[PDB]
Design a protein around this nucleic acid. Structure first.
Ligand SMILES: [Mg+2]
Ligand SMILES: [Mg+2]
Ligand SMILES: [Mg+2]
Ligand SMILES: [Mg+2]
Ligand SMILES: [Mg+2]
Ligand SMILES: [Mg+2]
Ligand SMILES: [Mg+2]
Ligand SMILES: [Mg+2]
Ligand SMILES: [Mg+2]
Ligand SMILES: [Mg+2]
Ligand SMILES: [Mg+2]
Ligand SMILES: [Mg+2]
Ligand SMILES: [Mg+2]
Ligand SMILES: [Mg+2]
Ligand SMILES: [Mg+2]
Ligand SMILES: [Mg+2]
Ligand SMILES: [Mg+2]
Ligand SMILES: [Mg+2]
Ligand SMILES: [Mg+2]
Ligand SMILES: [Mg+2]
Ligand SMILES: [Mg+2]
Ligand SMILES: [Mg+2]
Ligand SMILES: [Mg+2]
Ligand SMILES: [Mg+2]
Ligand SMILES: [Mg+2]
Ligand SMILES: [Mg+2]
Ligand SMILES: [Mg+2]
Ligand SMILES: [Mg+2]
Ligand SMILES: [Mg+2]
Ligand SMILES: [Mg+2]
Ligand SMILES: [Mg+2]
Ligand SMILES: [Mg+2]
Ligand SMILES: [Mg+2]
Ligand SMILES: [Mg+2]
Ligand SMILES: [Mg+2]
Ligand SMILES: [Mg+2]
Ligand SMILES: [Mg+2]
Ligand SMILES: [Mg+2]
Ligand SMILES: [Mg+2]
Ligand SMILES: [Mg+2]
Ligand SMILES: [Mg+2]
Lengths: 87, 70, 116, 101
RNA sequence: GUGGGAGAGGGUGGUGGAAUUCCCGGAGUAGCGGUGAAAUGCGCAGAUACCGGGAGGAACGCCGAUGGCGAAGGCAGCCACCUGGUCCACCCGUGACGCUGAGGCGCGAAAGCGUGGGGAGCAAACCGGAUUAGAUACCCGGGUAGUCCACGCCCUAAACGAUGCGCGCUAGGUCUCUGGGUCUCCUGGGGGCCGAAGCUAACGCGUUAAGCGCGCCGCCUGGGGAGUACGGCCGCAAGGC
C-alpha cells in the first residue's frame, strides 16, 4: 500500500514549516513516492496497462509542479531535485 | 407473501457462516432470490450475494436443488 | 426376474422424442421404452400420445417385473413430457413423488448455432 | 499485519489421534507463517448442502487471526496440502454490516 | 492534507460448483438422433435413457438490473495479494501552479500472422445428407484452422451517443446508483425519462444541450472515378496510414 505514517514520515521530512501539509515541495515528494511504488509494480506485471495510465498522469502532475518551482524559485527547485533524485 | 427482510431481526448480512438466516434467502431450488422477493436494497442484495456465494463455496449452502411436484 | 416392487421412473422428454426408463431404488434400470420403441418412426415419435404409450409400455413392463410404488424424475421439456407423467399416474403404479431434475449448466459450454 | 478469518473443513470421520494431529499441524502452520491467533471457533460436525469428497458431511473450524499481508496466500497453500483437509477458505475481516436495523 | 465510501477499473497466483465431451464400471434392449417431412450418422464389438468413479478443456446459471467501473477498447463464480481511477465531508496546507494540444510516445474489439503449448464444446475451409428447376446457399450429420494460454507482431470497425476536451451561464418534474446532512426532505456526485426558455430542415436536443458564451485541437467543401492509382512510411505477411 502506502500506510499512514509511512506517508507521514515523508510529509514531515518535506514540509517547509511545521503544519504544512500541502506545499509544493511536499506535493512533489508524495508524488515521487507514489510514482516509485507504481514503477516498481509495473517492473513485474508489465501486462497491467490500466495502471500504467495512472503513471503517465502521475508523472505529468509531478512535472508540472516541478516546472512551477523552477519558474518561481530556482533555488528551492535545486533543493527539491537534490533531496529527491529527479531530473 | 411479503418479503424476507420483513420477517427478521438485526442479522449480519456479511455472515457467511450463518446458514439459518441465509437459507431463508434462496428458492425452493438453489437459486439466490430476486430483489422483488428478498426486499433488500441494492447494496443490501449485492452483499447478500457475495456472502451466499462464499458460504456455498464453503459447503453449508446449496448450489442448486431439485424441484418438487411439477 | 428380481421382483423389485418399488422404485425410480425417469421421463427424459426431448422435442423430438420422449424416453421413459424404469429403475430400482438405488438407480439400476429395470426396463425402458420410447416413441420408436413402439411403432412410431419420425416426428411422430415426439408426440404427447407417443409419450403416453411409452409411459404405459415401460410401466406394463415393470409391473410384470413386480413394481408398484414409484417416485418420478423428469428431465427435459416438450410435447408430452407432461403427458408421460399423466400416463404414469394412470398406469396403476402409485406415483409417489414427482420431481423435476432438468440439468441446466451454470454456463460453460458454447452451444450449436441452432441454440443461441 | 491484517485481520483475517481462516476457514477449515476437514474429514468428519476423524477420531482423536488423527484430528488433534491435523490440529497441531494447523497450529504449526499459523505459528510458522507469522500468524497470531485472535480467537477460535471449532463447530465440528455439520450437514453439508452437497457431498464434498463423497462425504454427506463435514468438520468445521474458524480461526480469526492477524498476520502479514505478503504471506497469507502461502499460508493457505501449505494448509491445503493436507489430505484430510477438504476446504480452506481464507478471508479478510469486515465489520458487521447490519440489515433490517 | 485528513477522514470516510461505492465499483464486473487493471495484473498476478489460488480455488469452487453446474453442464458437455471422453474413458472405466454397474444394470438394461433395440433403438437413438435428427426434420417441414427426411436422409446421411451412431447402435448387437450392446448405443440411447440410468446409477457410480475418473480425466480434460472452456465458460461462470440465480443474483442481474431500465445497475456498476473504466479514457477508450472493454470488464461478471469465489479468495488472496499487487495496483489505477474516482466521490463526499472538514475548509486545514500551496498560492494561478491553469485549459487545449500539431508532432511524438502508449493503449487499442474481433479476425489475422510468428514460435511454442493446449484442445472439451463450437466451427470459415472442407466431406457427406435432404430441399429444390438447380447447390457451392438457407435445414441435417461430420470436421480443420481458429477459438483457449504464453511471448512477439498486426492498428482495423456501425472503435456509435454516427455527438472532440475544458469552463461559466439559462425553469421544473419523475425514476434510479452512490456519498453527506439537523433524514416529509434537503445537499453533492453518476445513470435514465419527460419538459421552461432557446435551438433545429425536420426528426428531434433541452443543467448528461443539439441552448447562451470563451479557449484550443480535429475535420468538411456536388455524386461518381476511389479509399482507387502513384509516391513515401510502417508491416514477416495479410495489409495499414
Ligand atoms: Mg424425432
Ligand atoms: Mg482519502
Ligand atoms: Mg474487477
Ligand atoms: Mg481483476
Ligand atoms: Mg450402421
Ligand atoms: Mg457419468
Ligand atoms: Mg484428453
Ligand atoms: Mg437474467
Ligand atoms: Mg461499447
Ligand atoms: Mg483502490
Ligand atoms: Mg485555506
Ligand atoms: Mg497565505
Ligand atoms: Mg503572481
Ligand atoms: Mg495535424
Ligand atoms: Mg496526439
Ligand atoms: Mg484475438
Ligand atoms: Mg492464414
Ligand atoms: Mg497462432
Ligand atoms: Mg499453434
Ligand atoms: Mg455444420
Ligand atoms: Mg452441403
Ligand atoms: Mg430453392
Ligand atoms: Mg457438430
Ligand atoms: Mg487488435
Ligand atoms: Mg451504439
Ligand atoms: Mg465545436
Ligand atoms: Mg441516507
Ligand atoms: Mg441523495
Ligand atoms: Mg441528477
Ligand atoms: Mg434529472
Ligand atoms: Mg425530451
Ligand atoms: Mg418546430
Ligand atoms: Mg415535434
Ligand atoms: Mg456544456
Ligand atoms: Mg468529388
Ligand atoms: Mg467530382
Ligand atoms: Mg504521386
Ligand atoms: Mg503503396
Ligand atoms: Mg519493407
Ligand atoms: Mg483489407
Ligand atoms: Mg483500408
Amino acid at each position: 500500500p502506502i500506510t499512514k505514517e509511512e506517508k507521514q514520515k515523508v510529509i514531515q521530512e518535506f514540509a517547509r514549516f511545521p503544519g504544512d501539509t500541502g506545499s509544493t515541495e511536499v506535493q512533489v515528494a508524495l508524488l515521487t513516492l507514489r510514482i516509485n511504488r507504481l514503477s516498481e509494480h509495473l517492473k513485474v506485471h508489465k501486462k497491467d496497462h490500466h495502471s500504467h495510465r495512472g503513471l503517465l498522469m502521475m508523472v505529468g502532475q509531478r512535472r508540472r509542479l516541478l516546472r512551477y518551482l523552477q519558474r518561481e524559485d530556482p533555488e528551492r527547485y535545486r533543493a527539491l531535485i537534490e533531496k529527491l533524485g529527479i531530473r | 407473501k411479503a418479503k424476507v427482510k420483513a420477517t427478521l431481526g438485526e442479522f449480519d448480512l456479511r455472515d457467511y457462516r450463518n446458514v439459518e438466516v441465509l437459507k431463508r434467502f434462496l428458492s425452493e431450488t438453489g437459486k439466490i432470490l430476486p430483489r422483488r422477493r428478498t426486499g433488500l436494497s441494492a447494496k443490501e442484495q449485492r452483499i447478500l450475494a457475495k456472502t451466499i456465494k462464499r458460504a456455498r463455496i464453503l459447503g453449508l449452502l446449496p448450489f442448486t436443488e431439485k424441484l418438487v411436484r411439477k | 426376474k428380481r421382483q423389485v416392487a418399488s422404485g425410480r421412473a425417469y421421463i427424459h422428454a426431448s422435442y423430438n422424442n420422449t424416453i421413459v426408463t424404469i429403475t430400482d431404488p438405488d438407480g439400476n434400470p429395470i426396463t425402458w421404452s420410447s416413441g420408436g420403441v413402439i411403432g412410431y418412426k419420425g416426428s411422430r415419435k415426439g408426440t404427447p400420445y407417443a409419450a403416453q404409450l411409452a409411459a404405459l409400455d415401460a410401466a406394463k413392463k415393470a409391473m410384470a417385473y413386480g413394481m408398484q410404488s414409484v417416485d418420478v424424475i423428469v428431465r427435459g421439456t416438450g410435447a408430452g413430457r407432461e403427458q408421460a407423467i399423466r400416463a404414469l399416474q394412470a398406469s396403476g403404479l402409485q406415483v409417489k413423488s414427482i420431481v423435476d431434475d432438468t440439468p441446466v449448466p451454470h454456463n460453460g459450454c458454447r452451444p450449436k448455432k441452432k441454440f443461441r | 499485519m491484517r485481520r483475517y478469518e481462516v476457514n477449515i473443513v476437514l474429514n468428519p470421520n476423524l477420531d482423536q489421534s488423527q484430528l488433534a494431529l491435523e490440529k497441531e499441524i494447523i497450529q504449526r502452520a499459523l505459528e510458522n507463517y507469522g500468524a497470531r491467533v485472535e480467537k477460535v471457533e471449532e463447530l465440528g460436525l455439520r450437514r453439508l448442502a452437497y457431498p464434498i469428497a463423497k462425504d454427506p458431511q463435514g468438520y468445521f473450524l474458524w480461526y480469526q487471526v492477524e498476520m502479514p499481508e505478503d504471506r497469507v496466500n502461502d499460508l493457505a497453500r501449505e494448509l491445503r496440502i493436507r489430505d484430510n483437509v477438504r476446504r480452506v477458505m481464507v478471508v479478510k475481516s469486515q465489520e458487521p454490516f447490519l440489515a433490517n436495523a
